[PDB]
Amino acid sequence: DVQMTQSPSNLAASPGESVSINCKASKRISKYLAWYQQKPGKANKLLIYSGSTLQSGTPSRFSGSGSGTDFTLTIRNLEPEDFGLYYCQQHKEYPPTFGAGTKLELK
Amino acid sequence: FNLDAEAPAVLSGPPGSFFGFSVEFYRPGTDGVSVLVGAPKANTSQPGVLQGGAVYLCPWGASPTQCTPIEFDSKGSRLLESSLSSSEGEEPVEYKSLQWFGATVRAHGSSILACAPLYSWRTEKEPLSDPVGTCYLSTDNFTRILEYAPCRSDFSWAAGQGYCQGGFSAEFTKTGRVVLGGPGSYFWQGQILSATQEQIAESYYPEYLINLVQGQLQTRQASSIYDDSYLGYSVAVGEFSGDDTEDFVAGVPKGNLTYGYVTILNGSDIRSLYNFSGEQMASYFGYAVAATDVNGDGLDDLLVGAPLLMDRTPDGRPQEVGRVYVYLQHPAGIEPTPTLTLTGHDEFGRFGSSLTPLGDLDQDGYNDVAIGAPFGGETQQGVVFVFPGGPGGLGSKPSQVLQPLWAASHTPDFFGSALRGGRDLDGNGYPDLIVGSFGVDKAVVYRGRP
Amino acid sequence: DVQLMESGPGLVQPSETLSLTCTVSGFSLTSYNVHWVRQPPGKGLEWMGVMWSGGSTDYNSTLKSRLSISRDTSQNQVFLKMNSLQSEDTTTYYCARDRTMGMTTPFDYWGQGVMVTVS
Amino acid sequence: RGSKDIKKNKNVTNRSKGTAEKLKPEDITQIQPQQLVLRLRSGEPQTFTLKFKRAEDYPIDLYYLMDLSYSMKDDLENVKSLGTDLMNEMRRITSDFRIGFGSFVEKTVMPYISTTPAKLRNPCTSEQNCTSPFSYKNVLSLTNKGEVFNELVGKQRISGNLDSPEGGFDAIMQVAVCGSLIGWRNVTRLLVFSTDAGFHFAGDGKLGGIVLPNDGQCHLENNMYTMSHYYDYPSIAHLVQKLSENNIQTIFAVTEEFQPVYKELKNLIPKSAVGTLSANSSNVIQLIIDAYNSLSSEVILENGKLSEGVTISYKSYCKNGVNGTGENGRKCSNISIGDEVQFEISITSNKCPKKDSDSFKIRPLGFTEEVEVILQYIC
Ligand SMILES: *[C@@H]1O[C@H](CO)[C@@H](O[C@@H]2O[C@H](CO)[C@@H](O[C@@H]3O[C@H](CO[C@H]4O[C@H](CO)[C@@H](O)[C@H](O[C@H]5O[C@H](CO)[C@@H](O)[C@H](O)[C@@H]5O)[C@@H]4O)[C@@H](O)[C@H](O[C@H]4O[C@H](CO)[C@@H](O)[C@H](O)[C@@H]4O)[C@@H]3O)[C@H](O)[C@H]2NC(C)=O)[C@H](O)[C@H]1NC(C)=O
Ligand SMILES: *[C@@H]1O[C@H](CO)[C@@H](O[C@@H]2O[C@H](CO)[C@@H](O[C@@H]3O[C@H](CO)[C@@H](O)[C@H](O[C@H]4O[C@H](CO)[C@@H](O)[C@H](O)[C@@H]4O)[C@@H]3O)[C@H](O)[C@H]2NC(C)=O)[C@H](O)[C@H]1NC(C)=O
Ligand SMILES: *[C@@H]1O[C@H](CO)[C@@H](O[C@@H]2O[C@H](CO)[C@@H](O[C@@H]3O[C@H](CO)[C@@H](O)[C@H](O)[C@@H]3O)[C@H](O)[C@H]2NC(C)=O)[C@H](O)[C@H]1NC(C)=O
Ligand SMILES: *[C@@H]1O[C@H](CO)[C@@H](O[C@@H]2O[C@H](CO)[C@@H](O[C@@H]3O[C@H](CO)[C@@H](O)[C@H](O)[C@@H]3O)[C@H](O)[C@H]2NC(C)=O)[C@H](O)[C@H]1NC(C)=O
Ligand SMILES: *[C@@H]1O[C@H](CO)[C@@H](O[C@@H]2O[C@H](CO)[C@@H](O[C@@H]3O[C@H](CO)[C@@H](O)[C@H](O)[C@@H]3O)[C@H](O)[C@H]2NC(C)=O)[C@H](O)[C@H]1NC(C)=O
Ligand SMILES: *[C@@H]1O[C@H](CO)[C@@H](O[C@@H]2O[C@H](CO)[C@@H](O[C@@H]3O[C@H](CO)[C@@H](O)[C@H](O)[C@@H]3O)[C@H](O)[C@H]2NC(C)=O)[C@H](O)[C@H]1NC(C)=O
Ligand SMILES: *[C@@H]1O[C@H](CO)[C@@H](O[C@@H]2O[C@H](CO)[C@@H](O[C@@H]3O[C@H](CO)[C@@H](O)[C@H](O)[C@@H]3O)[C@H](O)[C@H]2NC(C)=O)[C@H](O)[C@H]1NC(C)=O
Ligand SMILES: *[C@@H]1O[C@H](CO)[C@@H](O[C@@H]2O[C@H](CO)[C@@H](O)[C@H](O)[C@H]2NC(C)=O)[C@H](O)[C@H]1NC(C)=O
Ligand SMILES: *[C@@H]1O[C@H](CO)[C@@H](O[C@@H]2O[C@H](CO)[C@@H](O)[C@H](O)[C@H]2NC(C)=O)[C@H](O)[C@H]1NC(C)=O
Ligand SMILES: *[C@@H]1O[C@H](CO)[C@@H](O[C@@H]2O[C@H](CO)[C@@H](O)[C@H](O)[C@H]2NC(C)=O)[C@H](O)[C@H]1NC(C)=O
Ligand SMILES: *[C@@H]1O[C@H](CO)[C@@H](O)[C@H](O)[C@H]1NC(C)=O
Ligand SMILES: [Ca+2]
Ligand SMILES: [Ca+2]
Ligand SMILES: [Ca+2]
Ligand SMILES: [Ca+2]
Ligand SMILES: [Ca+2]
Ligand SMILES: [Ca+2]
Ligand SMILES: [Ca+2]
Secondary structure: OOOEEEOOOEEEEOOOOOEEEEEEEOOOOOOOEEEEEEOOOOOOEEEEEOOOEEOOOOOOOEEEEEEOOEEEEEEOOOOHHHOOEEEEEEOOOOOOEEOOOEEEEEO | OOEOOOOOEEEEOOOOOOOOOEEEEEOOOOOOOEEEEEEOOOOOOOOOOOOOOEEEEEEOOOOOOOOEEEOOOOOOOOEOHHHHHOOOOOOEOEEOOOOOOOOEEEEEOOEEEEEEOOOEEOOOOOOOOEOOOEEEEEEOOOOEEEEEOOOOOOEOOOOOOOOOOOOOEEEEOOOOOEEEEEOOHHHHOEEEEEEOHHHHHHHOOOOOOOOOOOOOEEOOOOOHHHOOOOEOOOEEEEOOOOOOOOEEEEEEEEEEOOEEEEEEEOOOOOOEEEEEEOOOOOOOOOOEEEEEOOOOOOOOEEEEEEOOOEEEOOOOOEEEOOEEEEEOEEOOEEOOOOOEEEEOOOOOOOOOOEEEEEEOOOOOOOOEEEEEEOOOOOOOOOEEEEEOOOOOOOOOOOOEEEOOOOOOOOOOOOOOOEEEEEEOOOOOOOOEEEEEOHHHOEEEEEOEOO | OOEEEEEOOOEEOOOOEEEEEEEEEOOOOOOOEEEEEEEOOOOOOEEEEEEOOOOOEEEOOOOOOOOEEEEEOOOOEEEEEEEOOHHHOOEEEEEEEEOOOOEOOOOOEEOOOEEEEEO | OOEEEEEEOOOOOOOOOOOOOOOOOOOOOOEOOOEEEEEEEOOOOEEEEEEEEOOOOOOEEEEEEEEOOHHHHHHHHHHOOHHHHHHHHHOOOOOOEEEEEEEEOOOOOOOOOOOOHHHHHOOOOOOOOOOOOOOEEEEEEEEOOHHHHHHHHHOOOOOOOOOOOEOHHHHHHHHHHOHHHOOOOOOEEEEEEEEOOOEOOOOOHHHHOOOOOOOOOOOEEOOEEOHHHOOOOOOHHHHHHHHHHOOEEEEEEEOHHHHHHHHHHHHHOOOEEEEEOOOOOOOHHHHHHHHHHHHHOEEEEEEOOOOOOEEEEEEEEOHHHOEEEHHHHHEEEOOOOOOEEEEEEEEEEOOOOOOOOEEEEEEEOOOOOOEEEEEEEEO
């Protein structure tokens, strides 16, 4: 049973800046990590899966990295709609497990 | 005609273990020549494994020869790491019992490849029973052993690669690149997978059950109309382009409305070069395939076996007698119709059930070929035929016929169901031949006389 | 156009059985698994159980004695039934989709979630 | 030089008197010369004329072999009433008709089915409450009671497997060879093979580890085929041999999708017919009637193994002056009820088989009536 720990509980940034979110696993999980975005009034949206593969609709400013136990999500140029909540899910083994989530707010 | 058929060497294995299901030559340098025999149903010392299968090393010489198993894998079935912490109790994530390890054995240099087509495995997510299949690759004379299971991937079901049964057939290219055939991928469309030993050893990471080998070559999934084609039922390697990379010959026994067809895939990138079609429905055209130059032109020629072809006697009675097709390659390419066809004589003999180049057995300048009929002969014990090469192509009349020396039993001997030739065990200039008779758990080594 | 929609009572007594429904569109329940996930008031997401594509179910070991998951392929609906508890007040429940037979994926679609209060 | 003699030449049973002349199946005669003796000089041919006449009211036994994959549930719902509708229909054709039922899905081994315990207990989805997979099951032996067929077919359970092709050839072999357990008589034997998918055949067992060829013996225990895990699927040649040996006439009722495959199968299998089945087996009775007409309106002659130095040739003189030679000369078409056709059979010998009184038999496919030929060599 993989425990996922997501490093920054809160982030402050301004539009046009760049930020990084780190998600770490209790055991090596190869490349099977996925990143999600949650805007307050809408459903969770899949951004990246398998560590670095973008979902079809994902803007190119999102990029994933890392393997093994350490992973990171990087947002290149913050538009105002990128602020919200972000989750990491490991999809290597069942049962599914998720990170605690990170909240991104204006500076 | 010069095989020592009056006193061949007979190797014996444990009863009921299918000893002799697949045979191969082995010499890891230093003239340490040896014979490799697969026993897909043999019992092993692995804890908790029932009839896991085994491979036997039988060194040549020293008058009698004792066959000892090789420990490719001394461990039992792995456990699902979630189950260790779960209160439900431990679960096997893997099923090695009745895995038919050793169903196919191949060697090149000091490397040995042995595969277990019936190996099953339940995904780490949902409890499936996918028979992915697995292979173990010995390297540098057993100094390192690596598991290679390319079909154990993220496409985990019959719809994907779950039922791939990778390693159902396999072969080494002259450079040592590994080639596998999975008849089951994508609802039994079949698949061919290839990778180099360097790539396998570089990407090795045993703790990841799913681990993709970088640089691997494989065929692409096709539309549903191609389902149940069994691509990769048999494989072979030969040169059929104007390059120096051997190209993959694969059989598709059920491809075109149960008419078989054999496809030659470009070695450099796995893409189709030629297609050849069978002549009769459900003849299993492509059950066996081989590639060797039979007419001395230096260009490899193709052989295909259709053991279930049905012919009619002059009297008018239909009978099941296999057939073998020969396609001679020429500088402009290789024509789509066979230049020659050989037909069996024993009803239900399954003449084209196995094939193997013999090299130039009589050293006359043209390579020869051996064809096995596992249920031929008067007692239905099986027969192996030797056909001589020649300037005009393969001869039409066998130059020698090999049959078991022992008496028939209650069960078939399957003599000639597995073959391997083209290598020399004595050091003479004359290649030898090894025939599998797994029906009686025996393998016979025939030596070419000068 | 895949879409998972969630429904259920907004307020239940501590003794009643909590019944939730996930109505799906754009796909057939016989091809994908539908999961149930919950987020307590100030914690991360927790997996509850799965309705396999084949019609069987699996539950979180801690909640297996309380949970009960069912479906109605005719109505494209998946149900969750649970024993209610006060200590689980203002928890939000989600239903998500993923594939395990064939091209396996993570949770590729989610519902908006429903917040259930216990009093 | 060569010479010819005839020993038994009973005339055909025309029963032109009327319906009062009822006859047993063995009393009906359709091939006129029942016995001959020929003396052969080396290289000298001898010929004789063979006469066939189709009977009027030959009995019929029909065995209905049906696929029970989940896609055939609607088909079963319609086949339920066949036990009455088909007998009512056949009463226009024959006065004595018997029917029987059987079912099959697939081999119960690793590659062809899901071997997890849950799937072995139920191969389909939970809503599709399928039963466990099975190889072959003889539900009802041949009988003349239609209501029994109706009830038993109604009580059957659908099943399923993994791969699209189905293992119906095992069931075909068992039906052909099991004889008394199925109740075949020495009358018109019809085997109706119904399915909506392809078929496995010999060589497919290697994937599951089944390498032992089918032996062609009956292996029914409690009306279940027990050795499905032990023997490979039959080959088409083996099925041809056994079907022709046991006088089985096959009718392939398959859906539109697999017509191209089953038409070639029909071409390979002698004395067989193929028809287009509906998505839910609603036209099966008409398929059966049309296939029966097609089969019974044709005659094909077979002969046994001949000595090494002996050869045979056929010439058929059918209706309307259309004749044949070679492989086509051992066949006639459009033989109506009460019609009469003739064949010319030519034998030759090129050696001296040690002065032995050899013999062999000739018969029309699908019948037990034979013509016995005795060969003697002038040497
Ligand atoms: C020997 O005989 C064999 C067997 O007949 C031949 O193999 C078959 O060849 C034909 C012709 O080349 C193949 O059909 C074509 O396949 C290509 C390749 O498709 C792949 O690449 C696409 C991008 O280039 C990709 O989009 C495809 O993925 C889609 O499709 C697959 C299913 O096909 C699906 O699973 C995916 O999800 C995608 O939806 C795939 O990866 C394809 O590009 C061709 O498309 C043309 O034709 C179609 C209609 O047929 C048309 O709609 C297109 O617009 C385009 O015009 C075409 O489908 C076939 O797949 C081969 N089958 C096998 C089993 O290999 C072989 O060619 C013969 N060799 C010789 C030398 O004669
Ligand atoms: C099955 O259901 C059970 C019951 O609902 C569920 O158990 C819960 O799991 C969560 C996640 O592990 C637990 O939450 C933890 O609570 C402790 C305090 O008790 C915190 O310290 C934890 O946070 C630490 O660890 C995180 C991950 O390493 C860090 O990100 C964080 O910064 C902290 O360091 C965490 O919040 C919860 O207590 C249990 N509840 C019970 C009743 O056991 C289980 O997760 C479900 N199974 C699955 C697979 O989801
Ligand atoms: C590999 O080892 C296993 C286990 O020793 C062998 O299987 C075992 O074989 C014996 C003898 O065939 C079985 O004993 C017999 O069982 C039957 C049925 O109960 C009984 O009627 C006989 O009197 C006798 O006791 C034994 O049950 C069986 N065990 C299992 C688990 O199957 C197997 O044959 C070996 N295989 C090879 C290739 O050596
Ligand atoms: C490649 O690996 C094989 C397998 O280990 C080697 O064959 C084995 O080599 C050892 C060492 O020479 C042999 O051990 C000897 O056994 C005899 C009894 O047979 C004993 O008297 C000696 O003292 C010694 O222990 C072993 O028998 C032999 N096994 C077989 C099946 O041949 C092989 O030598 C290796 N090749 C190279 C080039 O390293
Ligand atoms: C799939 O298989 C079918 C069946 O084998 C292939 O069709 C067959 O194609 C061959 C060669 O084109 C035909 O043979 C020819 O027959 C004529 C007489 O009709 C003869 O004059 C020619 O010399 C040649 O022998 C054969 O009749 C034909 N059969 C059928 C049923 O169509 C088909 O081409 C295959 N398709 C693929 C893509 O492999
Ligand atoms: C079998 O597959 C190999 C690999 O794809 C084929 O070789 C490749 O052939 C293409 C076409 O000739 C080569 O591309 C050419 O490269 C030259 C520069 O070297 C460029 O000037 C041309 O415009 C063209 O792009 C490619 O380099 C070559 N690759 C390798 C590794 O040799 C081969 O042709 C295939 N065999 C058959 C029979 O199709
Ligand atoms: C196919 O074979 C049959 C049988 O040998 C051939 O039948 C022959 O048909 C011709 C034309 O009708 C007959 O010619 C006339 O026959 C009558 C008696 O029916 C006779 O009185 C006339 O003097 C004249 O010969 C011929 O007899 C008849 N032969 C036999 C043995 O019945 C038929 O002609 C053949 N088909 C073709 C296309 O030739
Ligand atoms: C699946 O079908 C079987 C057979 O119809 C059901 O089992 C039957 O259940 C009834 C009522 O409980 C009994 O009278 C029969 O004796 C049972 N027969 C057998 C063979 O079990 C079973 O309950 C059904 N299950 C589902 C989930 O539909
Ligand atoms: C149906 O026809 C077959 C073939 O002629 C009959 O087979 C004979 O069976 C008897 C059994 O008493 C044997 O003595 C004969 O040797 C068999 N002959 C042959 C050629 O096999 C069979 O008896 C017939 N069945 C009935 C009920 O008459
Ligand atoms: C078998 O055929 C179809 C199977 O779906 C069904 O009959 C259909 O009924 C509708 C409604 O009356 C008609 O519009 C169709 O034309 C019918 N089609 C056929 C092929 O019958 C029903 O399941 C069965 N119908 C029978 C046995 O008559
Ligand atoms: C005769 O048989 C042939 C067989 O193909 C058929 O086409 C034809 O219609 C038949 N004619 C008559 C008059 O029965
Ligand atoms: Ca090449
Ligand atoms: Ca050549
Ligand atoms: Ca030679
Ligand atoms: Ca030698
Ligand atoms: Ca089916
Ligand atoms: Ca149907
Ligand atoms: Ca099947």
